[PDB]
What does this fold into?
Amino acid sequence: RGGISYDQLAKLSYEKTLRNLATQTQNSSKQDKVQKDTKTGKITIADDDKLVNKLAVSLQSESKKRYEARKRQMQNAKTLYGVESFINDKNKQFNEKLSRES
Amino acid sequence: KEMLAEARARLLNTQGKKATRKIRERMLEESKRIAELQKRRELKQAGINVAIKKPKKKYGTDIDYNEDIVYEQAPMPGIYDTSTEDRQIKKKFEQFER
Amino acid sequence: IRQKKARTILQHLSEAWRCWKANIPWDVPGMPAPIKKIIERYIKSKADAWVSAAHYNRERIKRGAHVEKTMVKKNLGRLTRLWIKNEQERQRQIQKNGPEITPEEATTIFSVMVEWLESRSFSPIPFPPLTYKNDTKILVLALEDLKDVYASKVRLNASEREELALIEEAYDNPHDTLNRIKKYLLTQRVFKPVDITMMENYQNISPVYSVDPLEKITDAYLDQYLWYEADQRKLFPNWIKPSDSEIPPLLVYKWTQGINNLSEIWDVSRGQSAVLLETTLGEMAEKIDFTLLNRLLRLIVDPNIADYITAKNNVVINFKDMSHVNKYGLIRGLKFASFIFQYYGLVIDLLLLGQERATDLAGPANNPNEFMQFKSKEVEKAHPIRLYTRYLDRIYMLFHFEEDEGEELTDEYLAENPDPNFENSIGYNNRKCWPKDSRMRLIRQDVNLGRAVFWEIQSRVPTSLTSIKWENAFVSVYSKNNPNLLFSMCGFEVRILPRQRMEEVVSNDEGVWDLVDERTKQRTAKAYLKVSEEEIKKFDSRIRGILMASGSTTFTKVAAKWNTSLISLFTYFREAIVATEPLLDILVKGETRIQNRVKLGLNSKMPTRFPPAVFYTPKELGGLGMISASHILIPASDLSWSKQTDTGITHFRAGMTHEDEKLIPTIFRYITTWE
Amino acid sequence: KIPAAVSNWKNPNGYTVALERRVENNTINDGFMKLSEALENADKKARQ
Amino acid sequence: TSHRPQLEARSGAKAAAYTPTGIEHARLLPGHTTLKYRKSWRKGTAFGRGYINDMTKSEYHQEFLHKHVR
Amino acid sequence: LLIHRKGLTYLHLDYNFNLKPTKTLTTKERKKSRLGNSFHLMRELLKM
Amino acid sequence: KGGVWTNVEDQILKAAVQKYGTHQWSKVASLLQKKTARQSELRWNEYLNPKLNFTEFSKEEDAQLLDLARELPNQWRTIADMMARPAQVCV
RNA sequence: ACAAUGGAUUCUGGUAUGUUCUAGCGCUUGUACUAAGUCUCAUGUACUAACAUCGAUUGC
It folds into this structure.
C-alpha cells in the first residue's frame, strides 16, 4: 500500500496520456522539419496547426474535467457530515482533517 | 432560552473587531465603486462622458499598476524563434479589446 | 514539505513550552519519534535560559540593583512556576519511593506520644455536641476573625462578596450555621481546591493559600474550638511558643531573665560551661506524613475531627495552569494549620528532651510549672538540658555542663569523626554583627564542644521528620575562654555578659537590658540588644513595596504607608535600633525615598523647594504628616577597629541635611522602651 | 506524517474541536502498606 | 490575524540596491585606528545511641528555592 | 529657515530665541513639531 | 445564592470547553449567567469531563478500595488517583 | 581641646488614526416674507480623569 512517489506518479501520468493519444489516433483512423537561421541562431520547427490545436484543446479539456471532478467533490463533502459541532466551512474541513489522521 | 440564544450567538462568532471593521469597510468600498459606476453609466446615457478617477497616491513613489507592466521579467531568450506566436497573440489580444 | 507543513509543526513547539510551564507532560499521539526528539531538545534549551534568567534576576532584586517594575512581576511569576514544579516533583518522589518515615520510626514516634499523654493523663478533645455551653461564643470569635479582613478594604470581588454574605447568614442564624459545621465535620471529606499565590518580599517569596469561603467558616470554627479546648485540657506545655500570654519582645525578655535567674551558669571557677543552641527545623511542615498525622490526632481528638483535618490537607493546589494533589505536605494556609503545626512540634519536642526531662520542664500534670520554673532546684541540676523553648520551627536549648560531663560529651564526638588538621573552626558559624571581641572566640575546646552538642541533638530526631542541619545551626558556648553568650530570638540579636566577666562596669544607654537575679535583687548580667540582619532587610523590602506598588498614587498615601511601616518597625524593636548602625543607614535611605516620591510626583527634586515643613507638618495644617526617624546624627566610629572591639560612639555622621536647620523629632523619644 | 496541532490554550480561528482532542499507570509500593500496618499494630498495642 | 511569525527573514539583497544616506553615527566615529600584528542523660531520649544535566533537578536549584521562598 | 522648511509655521521663533506655538496645536502637529536636543541646544546657545 | 446545575448550563459548558479549552474559565463562565469561573472549573473536573468514569465498581475495585482506605486513612484525593475515579464517587 | 556640609532638569501623556473634498471644458464619434457676534454667571445632559471614598465612641 502506501503513497506513490512523484517519479512514479509522473510516469503513470505519462503512460495515461499516451493511451489518450493512442485512442485519439484510433478514433481518427476509424473515421477515414528543422530550419536553423545562421544569423539569428534561432531554430524554427514547422508543424501541423491541427496537432497544435488538438494539444491546446485537450489541455483545456483535462483542466475543466479535473475542475468539475473537484467541484462535485466540494459539493458532496459539504453535505455528507454534520454530526460533530462546527462553526464555518474552514472548521468543518479541519475537523474532517482530524478524522483522516485517525 | 435567552442565555442559550446569547451563548449560541457568541460561540458562532470568531472574527474580532479589526476583522469585522475590515469587512464593514470592504463592503462600504464595494458599494462606493458600484454607485460611481452607475453614476457614470447614467451620465453616459445622457451623452456626457466622464472618466473613472484614479485612487490618489498615498506616498510619493506609489504605483499605478494599470499604466505600466510592472517589474516585467521577460521570458529568457530561447532557440525556438517565437515570432509568429507573438503576432497571433497580439492579433487575438487586439481582437479581445475590440 | 512546503510552507504549509512547516507552519503547522511550529505550533507543536509552542504547545510543548506551554506544557512545560504548566508541568504537564507533552505527549502527542502519533508524533514521529525523530521530530518529538527535536522539540524536546529545544524545549529543554529554552528552559535552561528561562530558569537561569530567573536565578540571575532574583539575585539582582535582592541587591536592589536597577530592576524594572515589569521584571519584578515577571520574576515573581517565574519562581512560582519553579516552586510548584519543585513541589510537584517532590510529591512524586514520595509517591514512587514510599513514605520517608520507616515503620520502625513511626511506631516509636507513636509510642513516645502515647507514653507522654498517659503520664499527663490527657483527656482527648471530644466532638462538639449539640448542647455545648460555649458553642455560640466560639462561633462569634471565628466569624469576627474572618470579618477583620474586610473592614480594611473598600471594593470586593465575586468571591469576597460571597464571603461577607456567608458571615451575615451566620450572624443572623447562629443555631443553623452550627448545624452546618457539625454536619461538615462528621461527613464532608472531599473538599474544593485551593488557589495558591505567592507574595513578593524582594529577598524571598512567601506562599499564600486561598480556601473556599463556605469551607473557610468550618475551618475557622474548628481552629477556635481546638485551641480553646486544648488550653483547657492543657495540651501544649510551657515551652511551646507563641504563648498566647506574652508578646514576642516579652518572650525575649523572660528567656534572657530566666537564664540569669537559674543558678551557677556564669560561675566558671571550675571547668564548667554553658551552651546555647539555635536550629531551624528545616522543612518541618513540608515533611508531615498524613497517615502518621491521622494516627497521631486520634490520641488527642475524637476521630471524626481527626479525619476532617487529614482529609482537608489532601486537596488540589491550583496555580494558573498548574494543578496537583497535595499528597504529602501540610498546607499552612488552613485555619487549623496552627494547631497541627504545634502538635507536630510537640512530638519533636519529646524526641529531643525525652520522657524524663520533658516531665521535669513541664512539671506534673495537676500543678504544672511556669515557662522557666522547676519544682525544686535538685530537679534542675540533674540532666544538663536547662532551658528549652520552641518558637514556630526554631528551637532554643540551654545546656550547662560540668568539665567532666563536657569532656565525655566532646570525646565521643571526636571518636566518631575527628579532625587531624583541626578544621572544626572553619565551618563554625557565629554572629558577624557583633565585633570580634564580642562574638564567640573560636577556641578549639569550645568549638568541638559546640559541635558535639549539635551532634547529640541531630541524632535524636530522624531525618524523615525534620532536616536539622549545621548550616542552620547557631551554637554559642560560654566558658572561661568565652565571656559572651549569644543568641537570636524573635528578630532580636542578643549578646550577654555576666557582671563579673566585664573588665569594668560602665553605664549603658537604652539598648542594654539589665538582668536581675530573683533572690539577691541585684543586676548580675547585661543583655546587649541589636536587630537581626534578616529583619533589617525585611524592613528595607517593605519600603520597596511602598514605592513599587505606587504607580501614580497620591502624596499622602505614600506618607501614610511610610508611617504605618515606620511605627511597626519602632514599636516592635523598641530599644534595639540604637545599637544597630546598618538599620540607621536604612532609615535615612528609606525615608528619603519616600520624600523623593513626593518630589517625583512634581517635576523637581530640588532641595530648596522642599523644606521639612512640606513633609513633616501634620495633615490638619495641610502637610503630609510624615513621622521622621532620620533627622538624627548617626554614630560613625572607626570601621577598621569597630570590627575588632566596641569602640563606643566617638564621632557622629550627619543624617539628613537641610538649608534652614530644623530639629525634627523622632518617635524613639516618644515610644517607651521595652525594659 | 505530523498530527495537527490542537491546543488547550490558544484558538486563533475559533474552531470547535471535540473534547477528546482538546484535553497514570502505577500502584503504591509496599512502603505505604507497611507504614499503615505498623501504625495499627502500635495502636492495638497501645489500646491493650 | 495581524500578529504573525516570520516565513523568511529580511534579506540584505534589498538594502544593497538602495541609495545610501551618509548619516553620521556615534559608534562609527574613528576609534582604535591602529591594528596590532602578532609577532546517663543520653539514655532517656527516644532515639539514643555529583553533577546532573538538569537545571530543575540541580542541587543549586534546590538550595535556591529553599532560601528564596522560606 | 529650518522651522519653516519643516512646515512648522505655527511655531514662532522670537528674537530672543524663544520658541512658542502661535495656536493650540493638534496632536498630529505636536508630533511633527517636536524638535530634538540639537535644535534647542543650538537655540539656547544663540540665546546665550 | 449558590445555584444548582441545570442541563442547559451543562451543554453550554460543554460547548464552551469544546470552543475555549480548559485553561480559560472566566471566558467559559461569561457565557453562563449565575456561574463563577471557579464553579465551572470544578463542575467540569468533577462531573462533565468525559475522561471521568461514572460506572459501578467491580468486585475487585470494591476490595481494592477497602485496601487503599486503610493504607491512606483518609486521603480521598490520593485514593481517587489510584482508583482513577472521582473522589466523591470513592467516598 | 572640634575646624569634615551629597542633591538640583528636560523629553516621551484618549481622540488617536483614516478617507473624500474637479473651479477654469483637449479637437473625433456620441413676483412662494423679519432668528447677529464676543465675554461672564447659573442650571441640565453627554464624554473624560485609566482621580478619590469607610479613619474611631451609645440610651432597652
Notes: Chains F and C do not touch (no CB pair under 8 Å).
